[PDB]
């Protein structure tokens, strides 16, 4: 008893295939295609497992400065500061030279662990403020610097030393004043051309401010410029100034950790999500994306295509024939 049978091999086909690319062709379609791209976005920024600090009408440089409408960011260590696209700075408009570095250094610090220090300023009256800065009726100012000015009728030169005896680094965010007219410079201080001098054992920085009229932003015209210094273990910082002082009231703790900054406008939700992209915090289950290039956390990088579907399957053979 013998018969002729068959055991024809083959494979599986589905009539809903998706087009992919090959290096010898241009458009072929397969039985299965995972989109390695991630162009979708849920649109919710989630606050776990990374600690996410979100402003309401607050930006990070004004968060460290302590805008007197954002005084909830005292301390409040973070992992990602999300600024808001509807931001506005109600406290004494400023112009920092070299803006991208200071924002990047602070965002890499990772923590706003402030601590006061006993500074023996002699011959000054600290705690000055402005009228645009407001916590209700009255006045206001930044909550982390001293708006130094003159006292009586004089302005003595300043020499202040701080021996860093401990085992951590120190940041001293300070400032200089840029008046509008010569009358502003000669009234706040008694110097026509003030001088600041910051010295450590390694390097030094000397700045002479500028005078001139400016367009109005929320009143006045003037600006202040922010500078900074880093003190290593076993180093002594000497601050010398002849005028135009905005001297700090403490040192900001550094940390060699993992923290970033980002700009978006999505509000805050509750999730357990690791990757945060602007305009939608997306999950990382694919190696590529097409959302904005800015990215915090272990989640993929920008490629400019739209459908790089890796074939997790074989080449489509549609069911010929009818």
């Amino acid at each position: 008893a013998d018969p002729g049978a068959t055991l024809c091999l083959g494979h599986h086909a589905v009539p809903n295939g998706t087009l992919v690319k090959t290096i010898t062709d241009d458009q072929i379609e397969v039985t299965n295609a995972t989109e390695l791209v991630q162009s979708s976005s849920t649109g919710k920024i989630c606050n776990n497992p990374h600690r996410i600090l979100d402003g309401i009408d607050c930006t990070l440089i004004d968060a460290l400065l302590g805008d007197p409408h954002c005084d909830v960011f005292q301390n409040e260590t973070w992992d990602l500061f999300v600024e808001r696209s509807k931001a506005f700075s109600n406290c004494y408009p400023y112009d920092v030279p070299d803006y991208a570095s200071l924002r990047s250094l602070v965002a890499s610090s990772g923590t706003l662990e402030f601590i006061t220090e006993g500074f023996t300023w002699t011959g000054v009256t600290q705690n000055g403020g402005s009228n645009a800065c407001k916590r209700g009726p009255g006045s206001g100012f930044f909550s982390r610097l001293n708006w130094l000015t003159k006292s009586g009728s004089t302005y003595p030169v300043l020499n202040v030393t701080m021996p860093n005896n401990d085992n951590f680094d120190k940041l001293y965010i300070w400032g200089v004043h840029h008046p509008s007219t010569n009358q502003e410079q000669t009234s706040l201080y008694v110097q026509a051309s003030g001088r600041v001098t910051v010295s450590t054992r390694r390097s030094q920085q000397t700045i002479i401010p500028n005078i001139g009229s400016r367009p109005w932003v929320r009143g006045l015209s003037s600006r202040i410029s922010i500078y900074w210094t880093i003190v290593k273990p076993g180093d002594v910082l000497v601050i010398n100034s002849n005028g135009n002082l905005i001297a700090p009231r403490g040192y900001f703790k550094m940390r060699t950790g993992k923290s970033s900054i980002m700009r978006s406008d999505a509000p805050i939700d509750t999730c357990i999500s690791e990757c945060i992209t602007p305009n939608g915090s997306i999950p990382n289950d694919k190696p590529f994306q097409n959302v904005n290039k800015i990215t915090y956390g272990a989640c993929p990088k920008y490629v400019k295509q739209n459908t790089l579907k890796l074939a997790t399957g074989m080449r489509n053979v549609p069911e010929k024939q009818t």
Partner: protein, 87 residues
Amino acid sequence: SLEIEELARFAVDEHNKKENALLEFVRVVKAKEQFNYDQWQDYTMYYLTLEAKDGGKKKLYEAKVWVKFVDSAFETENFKELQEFKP
């Protein structure tokens, strides 16, 4: 009304503390805030013109009370200082 008289009392008793004599306030004649370029978001000096009856005679004065704003009740309050008290 109350602010100009309060600053007048501040000027007269700071002056009295400085030179170790006694003067008494009467009233304020003119209070002309400067409006050259800007009077707001910064120093807001009050050109205050006063007369006093301390030696039995009326003497005019002009006090350039440099009223710099403080930060709010998080920090110190009630900022004023007399730059110069001319007769």
